[PDB]
Scaffold this motif. Sequence first.
Motif, PDB file in Angstrom:
ATOM      1  N   UNK A  30       1.035  -1.439  -0.207  1.00  0.00           N
ATOM      2  CA  UNK A  30      -0.057   0.066   0.047  1.00  0.00           C
ATOM      3  C   UNK A  30       0.821   1.211  -0.035  1.00  0.00           C
ATOM      4  N   UNK A  31       1.960   1.253   0.668  1.00  0.00           N
ATOM      5  CA  UNK A  31       2.801   2.522   0.654  1.00  0.00           C
ATOM      6  C   UNK A  31       3.178   2.754  -0.605  1.00  0.00           C
ATOM      7  N   UNK A  32       3.352   1.748  -1.709  1.00  0.00           N
ATOM      8  CA  UNK A  32       3.688   2.114  -3.037  1.00  0.00           C
ATOM      9  C   UNK A  32       2.610   3.293  -3.600  1.00  0.00           C
ATOM     10  N   UNK A  44      11.278   7.533   0.351  1.00  0.00           N
ATOM     11  CA  UNK A  44      12.052   8.366   1.394  1.00  0.00           C
ATOM     12  C   UNK A  44      10.824   8.211   2.688  1.00  0.00           C
ATOM     13  N   UNK A  45      11.573   8.499   3.989  1.00  0.00           N
ATOM     14  CA  UNK A  45      10.856   8.535   5.177  1.00  0.00           C
ATOM     15  C   UNK A  45      10.273   7.208   5.360  1.00  0.00           C
ATOM     16  N   UNK A  46      11.027   6.132   5.450  1.00  0.00           N
ATOM     17  CA  UNK A  46      10.466   4.689   5.786  1.00  0.00           C
ATOM     18  C   UNK A  46       9.916   4.705   6.889  1.00  0.00           C
ATOM     19  N   UNK A  47      10.335   5.600   8.122  1.00  0.00           N
ATOM     20  CA  UNK A  47       9.668   5.354   9.368  1.00  0.00           C
ATOM     21  C   UNK A  47       8.217   5.518   9.553  1.00  0.00           C
ATOM     22  N   UNK A  48       7.808   6.179   8.646  1.00  0.00           N
ATOM     23  CA  UNK A  48       6.252   6.349   8.649  1.00  0.00           C
ATOM     24  C   UNK A  48       5.641   4.959   8.168  1.00  0.00           C
ATOM     25  N   UNK A  49       6.166   3.981   7.552  1.00  0.00           N
ATOM     26  CA  UNK A  49       5.693   2.669   7.330  1.00  0.00           C
ATOM     27  C   UNK A  49       5.578   1.805   8.445  1.00  0.00           C
ATOM     28  N   UNK A  61      12.751  -3.772   5.308  1.00  0.00           N
ATOM     29  CA  UNK A  61      11.671  -3.453   4.490  1.00  0.00           C
ATOM     30  C   UNK A  61      12.269  -2.636   3.212  1.00  0.00           C
ATOM     31  N   UNK A  62      13.184  -1.775   3.386  1.00  0.00           N
ATOM     32  CA  UNK A  62      13.628  -1.188   2.457  1.00  0.00           C
ATOM     33  C   UNK A  62      14.185  -1.955   1.216  1.00  0.00           C
TER      34      UNK A  62
END
Length: 98
Positions: A22-24, A30-35, A47-48
């Motif tokens: 869904x993040x796609x 950028x800013x993977x901490x929100x995921x 995850x990256x």
Amino acid sequence: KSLDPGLKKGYWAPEEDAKLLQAVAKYGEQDWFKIREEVPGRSDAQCRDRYLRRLHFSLKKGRWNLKEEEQLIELIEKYGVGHWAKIASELPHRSGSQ
DNA sequence: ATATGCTTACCGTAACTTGAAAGTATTTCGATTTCTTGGCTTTATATATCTTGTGGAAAGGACGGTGCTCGCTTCGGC
């Protein structure tokens, strides 16, 4: 990513097809901490690379045919060895781990 | 029945990131310095005239141990 009671060390992808993809459509690269605040059992660092090696499109894949050795030659001819040298920093998605 | 096939948990250094402690220039408050006038100190004969402050008078009130035996008085005697 260690000593955390909220992480899961599984091998398959239980609910990952919905939690992570869904993040796609939600966030950029950028800013993977929100995921990680919404996906439990997963850390952003792994995850990256999971997202990268799973959703890439331009890769040298398929069966070894009579034309792929020239591709390997021209790949190792761009800058040098490529696998572990510093020249891997400019190779687009041609990381040494692969 | 097992090795390389790709896949991904994670322990290799690195930099652009959030905000509290520490060094830096700057104008403003206040303290310091430097100008200004003007009297201090000498003199000059002048001398006015009116008050001040005094002073030797007048004249007062102000405080400056222990016998020992003559003789003094008071009643007090018949």
